[PDB]
mmCIF file of C-alpha atoms in Angstrom:
data_model
loop_
_atom_site.group_PDB
_atom_site.id
_atom_site.type_symbol
_atom_site.label_atom_id
_atom_site.label_comp_id
_atom_site.label_asym_id
_atom_site.label_seq_id
_atom_site.Cartn_x
_atom_site.Cartn_y
_atom_site.Cartn_z
ATOM 1 C CA UNK J 1 33.856 -71.412 -57.938
ATOM 2 C CA UNK J 2 31.823 -71.982 -54.755
ATOM 3 C CA UNK J 3 30.477 -68.422 -54.781
ATOM 4 C CA UNK J 4 29.292 -68.614 -58.395
ATOM 5 C CA UNK J 5 27.843 -72.085 -57.653
ATOM 6 C CA UNK J 6 25.943 -70.810 -54.600
ATOM 7 C CA UNK J 7 24.684 -67.762 -56.431
ATOM 8 C CA UNK J 8 23.458 -69.904 -59.354
ATOM 9 C CA UNK J 9 21.535 -72.078 -56.860
ATOM 10 C CA UNK J 10 20.051 -69.060 -55.049
ATOM 11 C CA UNK J 11 19.007 -67.752 -58.473
ATOM 12 C CA UNK J 12 16.760 -70.786 -58.922
ATOM 13 C CA UNK J 13 14.947 -70.136 -55.679
ATOM 14 C CA UNK J 14 11.537 -68.799 -56.455
ATOM 15 C CA UNK J 15 8.605 -68.195 -54.172
ATOM 16 C CA UNK J 16 7.730 -70.886 -51.691
ATOM 17 C CA UNK J 17 6.125 -71.828 -48.426
ATOM 18 C CA UNK J 18 7.912 -74.183 -46.051
ATOM 19 C CA UNK J 19 7.717 -75.406 -42.523
ATOM 20 C CA UNK J 20 10.782 -75.041 -40.315
ATOM 21 C CA UNK J 21 12.291 -76.217 -37.071
ATOM 22 C CA UNK J 22 14.863 -74.226 -35.081
ATOM 23 C CA UNK J 23 17.627 -75.330 -32.707
ATOM 24 C CA UNK J 24 19.600 -72.665 -30.855
ATOM 25 C CA UNK J 25 22.749 -73.836 -29.071
ATOM 26 C CA UNK J 26 25.439 -71.923 -27.202
ATOM 27 C CA UNK J 27 29.190 -71.732 -27.648
ATOM 28 C CA UNK J 28 29.623 -75.114 -25.943
ATOM 29 C CA UNK J 29 26.829 -76.771 -27.928
ATOM 30 C CA UNK J 30 24.380 -76.707 -24.993
ATOM 31 C CA UNK J 31 20.673 -76.437 -25.853
ATOM 32 C CA UNK J 32 19.371 -72.867 -25.532
ATOM 33 C CA UNK J 33 15.982 -73.340 -27.168
ATOM 34 C CA UNK J 34 14.076 -75.091 -29.929
ATOM 35 C CA UNK J 35 11.258 -73.739 -32.035
ATOM 36 C CA UNK J 36 9.185 -74.227 -35.150
ATOM 37 C CA UNK J 37 6.969 -72.310 -37.523
ATOM 38 C CA UNK J 38 6.247 -71.409 -41.150
ATOM 39 C CA UNK J 39 8.157 -69.459 -43.738
ATOM 40 C CA UNK J 40 6.837 -67.829 -46.926
ATOM 41 C CA UNK J 41 9.323 -66.276 -49.403
ATOM 42 C CA UNK J 42 9.022 -64.352 -52.653
ATOM 43 C CA UNK J 43 12.100 -63.084 -54.492
ATOM 44 C CA UNK J 44 13.890 -60.915 -54.397
ATOM 45 C CA UNK J 45 13.318 -59.686 -50.835
ATOM 46 C CA UNK J 46 9.845 -60.499 -49.515
ATOM 47 C CA UNK J 47 9.120 -62.873 -46.676
ATOM 48 C CA UNK J 48 6.790 -63.749 -43.835
ATOM 49 C CA UNK J 49 8.467 -65.720 -41.057
ATOM 50 C CA UNK J 50 5.995 -67.071 -38.522
ATOM 51 C CA UNK J 51 7.291 -68.789 -35.386
ATOM 52 C CA UNK J 52 4.813 -70.712 -33.202
ATOM 53 C CA UNK J 53 7.372 -72.200 -30.784
ATOM 54 C CA UNK J 54 8.743 -71.483 -28.245
ATOM 55 C CA UNK J 55 6.862 -68.190 -28.552
ATOM 56 C CA UNK J 56 4.741 -66.806 -31.346
ATOM 57 C CA UNK J 57 6.395 -64.042 -33.355
ATOM 58 C CA UNK J 58 6.034 -62.760 -36.897
ATOM 59 C CA UNK J 59 8.603 -61.057 -39.136
ATOM 60 C CA UNK J 60 7.294 -59.650 -42.401
ATOM 61 C CA UNK J 61 9.223 -57.931 -45.187
ATOM 62 C CA UNK J 62 7.181 -56.146 -47.783
ATOM 63 C CA UNK J 63 10.354 -55.313 -49.687
ATOM 64 C CA UNK J 64 10.823 -51.911 -48.086
ATOM 65 C CA UNK J 65 9.847 -52.217 -44.427
ATOM 66 C CA UNK J 66 10.553 -55.021 -41.947
ATOM 67 C CA UNK J 67 7.714 -55.519 -39.452
ATOM 68 C CA UNK J 68 8.136 -57.513 -36.228
ATOM 69 C CA UNK J 69 4.981 -58.519 -34.450
ATOM 70 C CA UNK J 70 4.770 -60.012 -30.977
ATOM 71 C CA UNK J 71 1.124 -61.168 -30.533
ATOM 72 C CA UNK J 72 1.757 -61.894 -26.852
ATOM 73 C CA UNK J 73 2.212 -58.251 -25.842
ATOM 74 C CA UNK J 74 0.168 -56.962 -28.801
ATOM 75 C CA UNK J 75 3.007 -54.839 -30.183
ATOM 76 C CA UNK J 76 4.638 -54.413 -33.563
ATOM 77 C CA UNK J 77 7.754 -52.539 -34.627
ATOM 78 C CA UNK J 78 8.682 -51.279 -38.107
ATOM 79 C CA UNK J 79 12.204 -50.498 -39.323
ATOM 80 C CA UNK J 80 13.512 -50.026 -42.862
ATOM 81 C CA UNK J 81 14.357 -53.404 -44.421
ATOM 82 C CA UNK J 82 17.717 -52.077 -45.665
ATOM 83 C CA UNK J 83 18.657 -51.303 -42.066
ATOM 84 C CA UNK J 84 17.670 -54.652 -40.633
ATOM 85 C CA UNK J 85 19.459 -56.484 -43.482
ATOM 86 C CA UNK J 86 22.517 -54.428 -44.317
ATOM 87 C CA UNK J 87 25.719 -56.447 -43.989
ATOM 88 C CA UNK J 88 23.851 -59.776 -43.565
ATOM 89 C CA UNK J 89 23.741 -62.790 -45.945
ATOM 90 C CA UNK J 90 20.271 -61.477 -46.995
ATOM 91 C CA UNK J 91 21.907 -59.174 -49.524
ATOM 92 C CA UNK J 92 23.387 -62.192 -51.337
ATOM 93 C CA UNK J 93 19.919 -63.242 -52.409
ATOM 94 C CA UNK J 94 18.108 -59.885 -52.340
ATOM 95 C CA UNK J 95 20.355 -58.422 -55.035
ATOM 96 C CA UNK J 96 23.350 -59.308 -57.161
ATOM 97 C CA UNK J 97 26.303 -57.093 -56.235
ATOM 98 C CA UNK J 98 29.720 -58.710 -56.458
ATOM 99 C CA UNK J 99 30.663 -56.335 -53.665
ATOM 100 C CA UNK J 100 28.474 -58.272 -51.217
ATOM 101 C CA UNK J 101 30.249 -61.526 -52.035
ATOM 102 C CA UNK J 102 33.676 -59.964 -51.475
ATOM 103 C CA UNK J 103 32.708 -59.532 -47.820
ATOM 104 C CA UNK J 104 32.845 -63.294 -47.271
ATOM 105 C CA UNK J 105 35.132 -66.288 -47.569
ATOM 106 C CA UNK J 106 33.234 -69.298 -48.780
ATOM 107 C CA UNK J 107 33.803 -73.030 -48.564
ATOM 108 C CA UNK J 108 31.695 -75.729 -50.183
ATOM 109 C CA UNK J 109 31.287 -79.494 -50.149
ATOM 110 C CA UNK J 110 28.341 -80.615 -52.261
ATOM 111 C CA UNK J 111 25.139 -78.858 -51.192
ATOM 112 C CA UNK J 112 26.809 -77.528 -48.025
ATOM 113 C CA UNK J 113 28.246 -73.998 -47.974
ATOM 114 C CA UNK J 114 29.906 -72.074 -45.126
ATOM 115 C CA UNK J 115 30.172 -68.297 -45.408
ATOM 116 C CA UNK J 116 32.575 -66.503 -43.104
ATOM 117 C CA UNK J 117 32.495 -62.694 -43.067
ATOM 118 C CA UNK J 118 36.065 -61.474 -43.654
ATOM 119 C CA UNK J 119 35.617 -58.837 -40.962
ATOM 120 C CA UNK J 120 35.840 -59.870 -37.282
ATOM 121 C CA UNK J 121 33.709 -56.889 -36.163
ATOM 122 C CA UNK J 122 30.334 -58.051 -37.462
ATOM 123 C CA UNK J 123 26.971 -59.351 -36.281
ATOM 124 C CA UNK J 124 27.570 -62.862 -37.554
ATOM 125 C CA UNK J 125 30.744 -64.814 -37.123
ATOM 126 C CA UNK J 126 29.572 -67.482 -39.594
ATOM 127 C CA UNK J 127 26.610 -68.549 -41.748
ATOM 128 C CA UNK J 128 25.936 -71.966 -43.257
ATOM 129 C CA UNK J 129 23.476 -73.131 -45.856
ATOM 130 C CA UNK J 130 22.522 -76.380 -47.493
ATOM 131 C CA UNK J 131 20.782 -75.857 -50.829
ATOM 132 C CA UNK J 132 20.422 -78.251 -53.735
ATOM 133 C CA UNK J 133 21.403 -77.514 -57.313
ATOM 134 C CA UNK J 134 17.673 -77.100 -58.061
ATOM 135 C CA UNK J 135 17.414 -74.135 -55.667
ATOM 136 C CA UNK J 136 15.699 -75.990 -52.822
ATOM 137 C CA UNK J 137 16.974 -74.697 -49.466
ATOM 138 C CA UNK J 138 17.256 -77.471 -46.889
ATOM 139 C CA UNK J 139 18.845 -75.726 -43.952
ATOM 140 C CA UNK J 140 20.843 -72.779 -42.772
ATOM 141 C CA UNK J 141 22.410 -71.486 -39.637
ATOM 142 C CA UNK J 142 23.830 -68.321 -38.207
ATOM 143 C CA UNK J 143 26.604 -68.044 -35.614
ATOM 144 C CA UNK J 144 26.562 -64.867 -33.562
ATOM 145 C CA UNK J 145 29.510 -62.973 -32.127
ATOM 146 C CA UNK J 146 28.487 -64.515 -28.778
ATOM 147 C CA UNK J 147 29.272 -67.905 -30.393
ATOM 148 C CA UNK J 148 25.605 -68.889 -30.192
ATOM 149 C CA UNK J 149 24.289 -70.766 -33.232
ATOM 150 C CA UNK J 150 20.717 -70.770 -34.524
ATOM 151 C CA UNK J 151 20.113 -73.684 -36.936
ATOM 152 C CA UNK J 152 17.009 -73.994 -39.132
ATOM 153 C CA UNK J 153 15.785 -77.073 -41.035
ATOM 154 C CA UNK J 154 13.181 -76.500 -43.789
ATOM 155 C CA UNK J 155 10.658 -79.134 -44.819
ATOM 156 C CA UNK J 156 7.681 -79.598 -47.099
ATOM 157 C CA UNK J 157 8.770 -76.852 -49.469
ATOM 158 C CA UNK J 158 5.929 -75.904 -51.817
ATOM 159 C CA UNK J 159 7.070 -73.618 -54.642
ATOM 160 C CA UNK J 160 4.507 -70.987 -55.644
ATOM 161 C CA UNK J 161 2.428 -71.380 -52.461
ATOM 162 C CA UNK J 162 2.317 -67.657 -51.650
ATOM 163 C CA UNK J 163 0.060 -64.622 -52.191
ATOM 164 C CA UNK J 164 0.881 -60.886 -52.129
ATOM 165 C CA UNK J 165 -1.070 -60.476 -48.898
ATOM 166 C CA UNK J 166 1.476 -62.645 -47.049
ATOM 167 C CA UNK J 167 4.104 -59.969 -47.628
ATOM 168 C CA UNK J 168 2.090 -57.060 -46.314
ATOM 169 C CA UNK J 169 1.558 -56.213 -42.701
ATOM 170 C CA UNK J 170 -1.606 -54.711 -41.309
ATOM 171 C CA UNK J 171 -1.516 -54.464 -37.505
ATOM 172 C CA UNK J 172 -4.480 -56.348 -36.017
ATOM 173 C CA UNK J 173 -7.014 -54.484 -33.888
ATOM 174 C CA UNK J 174 -5.599 -53.436 -30.539
ATOM 175 C CA UNK J 175 -1.985 -53.755 -31.694
ATOM 176 C CA UNK J 176 0.155 -50.647 -31.272
ATOM 177 C CA UNK J 177 2.996 -50.002 -33.702
ATOM 178 C CA UNK J 178 6.338 -48.512 -32.725
ATOM 179 C CA UNK J 179 7.354 -47.117 -36.110
ATOM 180 C CA UNK J 180 11.159 -46.776 -35.905
ATOM 181 C CA UNK J 181 11.556 -45.593 -39.477
ATOM 182 C CA UNK J 182 13.273 -42.227 -39.876
ATOM 183 C CA UNK J 183 11.650 -40.545 -42.886
#
């Protein structure tokens, strides 16, 4: 079905670097903000998301810890990756538990998929993704409980264009870290 199709496409995703543009719109479709940046990904759960517009921010997952860095105020925060990603579509690619898929209703038309969490008490009300049969992700979007949607368009995807260093976070000089990880 659509779930097995999506999973088989996500299974073909391997490491890559891509540029992205972001469009955030509110419940009525009004423009909230636009942005752009770079994304580096390495299965099953590593990534470096670097926004340059409207503000510069970095999100790095080294597979265990999620680091968020805000260069503007020279501050970084660390939380466990499991905590930042639990109950999000991330789990659908980060592992392969049929249980995760049971949490969503899915609808497909070609490369377009819409995932709707079955629960009404969640972070996301809806998630969409456009990914080719070859595993190339073209776009995705997340709709928050506040009805606000954040849409992302990927371009210039280069498979293999990553290095281990991209998925590690070393706070630059002068940057203070608020480590929110309970040990």
